[PDB]
């Protein structure tokens, strides 16, 4: 009935099969297509193109080649340099631009027509800052990998001012994964409460080097600022004594989601993981999980505005596409329970601020949910912690020996003072001065 084309800019692989985001995008177009209630009457056509992922000029033509053919929404380059070029293209010619990975949103770049389904590191850095207060740390240590990473944690760098943390920010060495000189210096500094900021590939390779230097013991706790801690092979580490906590937005409890993930690993047909990688085999990363949810947020909007048609836009002869402005408002007001919980956007700039994290940690069973974070709420932890009992029973025998006496001069009488006293200091005379000597010898506490 209706043909509707989407953008398909992805990374150019040349030897192996296509990337996890492109497979997620090919799957999400195919999944909605036979599912004829959600988008029932339209024939969504993917238009995939491939860039070298570090060329804004190559991403510029592949954007224009899709709009010269005519699309509805480009579903994002996956790098900060190339996305900013295509964001300026989609802002000018009018089409929405759907983003699934984080970038540095420039505060003076007044743009519309873009949303980012990745959870914002403004909101995430609260949740790490909430989590370090739950464990009551004072000697935290941020380890990042890219110079971009200080932007991604800037609310944590800005908090020795308000709270009592003492940040000791370090950087992984570039051009390698040999972080052997780093963790030796971190063992020397007794860095016991490390917060990593890595991808899940470098989060796996940092732990084997942490294991080989014996640095994963009972008095090391690792917070991973990532959303794919659950996809690590934690089997060498499960008995190690190491506490390690992360976050997860991917619902592993919903049977609808778990049906997709079970269907995913079958439909991958991907190059097998090396056992020296340290990763588990069949799981959706949070990169491909959002790209699956990227189409479904758009698929809500095409229902509520069905009269939209495909127009062939020209970059050189730039014209604002007339259906986009109406279509963009349905995107920013969309609500959908995808793979990553609810997806609600931001009434300001199109970032994702209100979402649902599931704070997971390592116990001897494996990874395990020990709470839930929310921006509107705080930590809803003390999920498994239960009660905090206490029992000491001082006043050794079992009392501080209630002494009954009576006021008589000069034996027991009230003490004269300018300030009125309270307790045992009220009384003076012979017999309490006797009783202070009896309490010194026998070693008991008394209450007059």
Ligand X SMILES: *[C@@H]1O[C@H](CO)[C@@H](O[C@@H]2O[C@H](CO)[C@@H](O[C@@H]3O[C@H](CO[C@H]4O[C@H](CO)[C@@H](O)[C@H](O)[C@@H]4O)[C@@H](O)[C@H](O)[C@@H]3O)[C@H](O)[C@H]2NC(C)=O)[C@H](O)[C@H]1NC(C)=O
Ligand Y SMILES: *[C@H]1O[C@H](CO)[C@@H](O[C@@H]2O[C@H](CO)[C@@H](O[C@@H]3O[C@H](CO[C@H]4O[C@H](CO)[C@@H](O)[C@H](O)[C@@H]4O)[C@@H](O)[C@H](O)[C@@H]3O)[C@H](O)[C@H]2NC(C)=O)[C@H](O)[C@H]1NC(C)=O
Ligand Z SMILES: *[C@@H]1O[C@H](CO)[C@@H](O[C@@H]2O[C@H](CO)[C@@H](O)[C@H](O)[C@H]2NC(C)=O)[C@H](O)[C@H]1NC(C)=O
348 binds ligand NAG (CB under 6 A): yes
Least Cα distance to 158 among 113, 119, 128, 193 occurs for 128
**108 vs 279: CA distance, rounded Å:** 39
In this structure, the number of other CB atoms found within 10 A of the CB of residue 226 comes to 23
With 0-12 / 13-18 / 19 or more C-beta atoms within 10 angstroms meaning exposed / middle / buried, residue 103 is buried
Least Cα distance to 93 among 337, 315, 255, 373 occurs for 315
From the list ligand Z, ligand NAG, a copy of itself, none, which binds 41 (C-beta under 5 to 8 Å, kind-based)? Answer: ligand Z
Minimum Å distance from CB 135 to ligand Y? 8
From the list a copy of itself, ligand Y, ligand NAG, none, which binds 106 (C-beta under 5 to 8 Å, kind-based)? Answer: a copy of itself
**Helix, coil or strand: residue 416:** coil
Minimum Å distance from CB 220 to a copy of itself? 9
Quick one: which H or E segment has residue 203?
Answer: helix 200-212
- Of the listed pieces 15-23, 207-215, 316-324, 342-350, which binds ligand NAG according to CB under 6 A? 342-350
347 binds ligand NAG (CB under 6 A): yes
Looking at beta carbons only, is 161 or 348 nearer to ligand NAG?
348
Looking at beta carbons only, is 14 or 175 nearer to ligand NAG?
175
60 binds a copy of itself (CB under 8 A): yes
- Candidates 212, 396, 407, 434; binder of a copy of itself (CB under 8 A) is 212
- What does the chain come to in residues? 448
104 binds a copy of itself (CB under 8 A): yes
112 binds ligand NAG (CB under 6 A): no
Minimum Å distance from CB 213 to ligand X? 9
List 8's β-bridge partners, or say none: 48
Residue 342 CB contacts under 8 Å (≥ 6 apart), including other chains: 335, 336, 354, 355, 356
Binding site for ligand Y (CB under 6 A): 218, 241, 243, 363-364
Binding site for ligand Z (CB under 6 A): 1, 35, 37-38, 40-41, 256, 377, 380
From the list ligand NAG, ligand Y, a copy of itself, none, which binds 167 (C-beta under 5 to 8 Å, kind-based)? Answer: a copy of itself
Quick one: which H or E segment has residue 27?
Answer: helix 20-34
**262 vs 283: CA distance, rounded Å:** 8
Looking at beta carbons only, is 266 or 376 nearer to ligand NAG?
376
Minimum Å distance from CB 363 to ligand Y? 4
From the list ligand NAG, ligand Z, a copy of itself, none, which binds 347 (C-beta under 5 to 8 Å, kind-based)? Answer: ligand NAG
The contact pattern for a copy of itself, residues 134-173, with x = CB under 8 A and - = no contact, is: ------------xxx-xx--x--xx-xx----xxxxxx--
Residue 92 CB contacts under 8 Å (≥ 6 apart), including other chains: 318, 320
Quick one: which H or E segment has residue 196?
Answer: strand 193-196
Minimum Å distance from CB 351 to ligand NAG? 6
Looking at beta carbons only, is 193 or 332 nearer to ligand NAG?
332
**Helix, coil or strand: residue 319:** coil
Strand 350-352: give its sheet, edge to edge: 97-99, 114-119, 350-352
Binding site for ligand X (CB under 6 A): 240-243
317 binds a copy of itself (CB under 8 A): no
CB 194 within 8 A of CB 220: yes
% helix / strand / coil in the chain, to the nearest 5? 30, 15, 50
The contact pattern for ligand NAG, residues 416-435, with x = CB under 6 A and - = no contact, is: --------------------
353 binds ligand NAG (CB under 6 A): yes
**120 vs 113: CA distance, rounded Å:** 17
Looking at beta carbons only, is 278 or 350 nearer to ligand NAG?
350
Q: Which residues bind ligand NAG (CB under 6 A)?
A: 122, 346-349, 353
């Amino acid at each position: 009935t209706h043909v509707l084309r989407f953008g398909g800019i992805f990374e150019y692989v040349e030897s192996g099969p296509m990337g996890a985001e492109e497979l997620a995008f090919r799957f999400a177009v195919n999944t909605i297509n036979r599912n004829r209630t959600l988008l029932p009457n339209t024939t969504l056509t993917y238009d995939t193109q491939k860039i070298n992922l570090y060329d804004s000029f190559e991403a510029s033509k592949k954007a224009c080649d899709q709009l010269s053919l005519g699309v509805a929404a480009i579903f994002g380059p996956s790098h900060s340099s190339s996305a900013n070029a295509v964001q300026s293209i989609c802002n000018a010619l009018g089409v929405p631009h759907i983003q699934t990975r984080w970038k540095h949103q420039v505060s003076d770049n007044k743009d519309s027509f873009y949303v980012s389904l990745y959870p914002d590191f403004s909101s995430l850095s609260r949740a790490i800052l909430d989590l370090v207060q739950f464990f009551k740390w004072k000697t935290v240590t941020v380890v990042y990998d890219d110079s971009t990473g200080l932007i991604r944690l800037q609310e944590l760098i800005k908090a020795p001012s308000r709270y009592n943390l003492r940040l000791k920010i370090r950087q992984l060495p570039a051009d390698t994964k040999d972080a052997k000189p780093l963790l030796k210096e971190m063992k020397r500094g007794k860095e016991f409460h490390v917060i990593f900021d890595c991808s899940h590939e470098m989060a796996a390779g940092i732990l084997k080097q942490a294991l080989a230097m014996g640095m994963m013991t009972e008095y090391y706790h690792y917070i991973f600022t990532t959303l794919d801690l659950f996809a690590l092979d934690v089997e060498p580490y499960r008995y190690s004594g190491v506490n390690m906590t992360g976050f997860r937005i991917l619902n592993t409890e919903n049977t609808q989601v778990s049906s997709i993930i079970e269907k995913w690993s079958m439909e991958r047909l991907q190059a097998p993981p090396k056992p020296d990688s340290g990763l588990l085999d069949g799981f959706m990363t949070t990169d491909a999980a959002l790209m699956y949810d990227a189409v479904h947020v758009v698929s809500v909007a095409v229902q509520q505005f069905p009269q939209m048609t495909v127009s062939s836009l020209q970059c050189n002869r730039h014209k604002p596409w007339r259906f986009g402005t109406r279509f963009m408002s349905l995107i920013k007001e969309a609500h959908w329970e995808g793979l990553t919980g609810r997806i609600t956007f931001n009434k300001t700039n199109g970032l994702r601020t209100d979402f649902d994290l599931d704070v997971i940690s390592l116990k001897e069973e494996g990874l395990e949910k020990i709470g839930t974070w929310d921006p509107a709420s705080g930590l809803n932890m003390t999920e498994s912690q239960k009660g905090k009992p206490a029992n000491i029973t001082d006043s050794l025998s079992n009392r501080s020996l209630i002494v009954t006496t009576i006021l008589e001069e000069p034996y027991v009488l009230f003490k004269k003072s300018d300030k009125p006293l309270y307790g045992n200091d009220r009384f003076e005379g012979y017999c309490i001065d006797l009783l202070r000597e009896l309490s010194t010898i026998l070693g008991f506490t008394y209450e007059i």
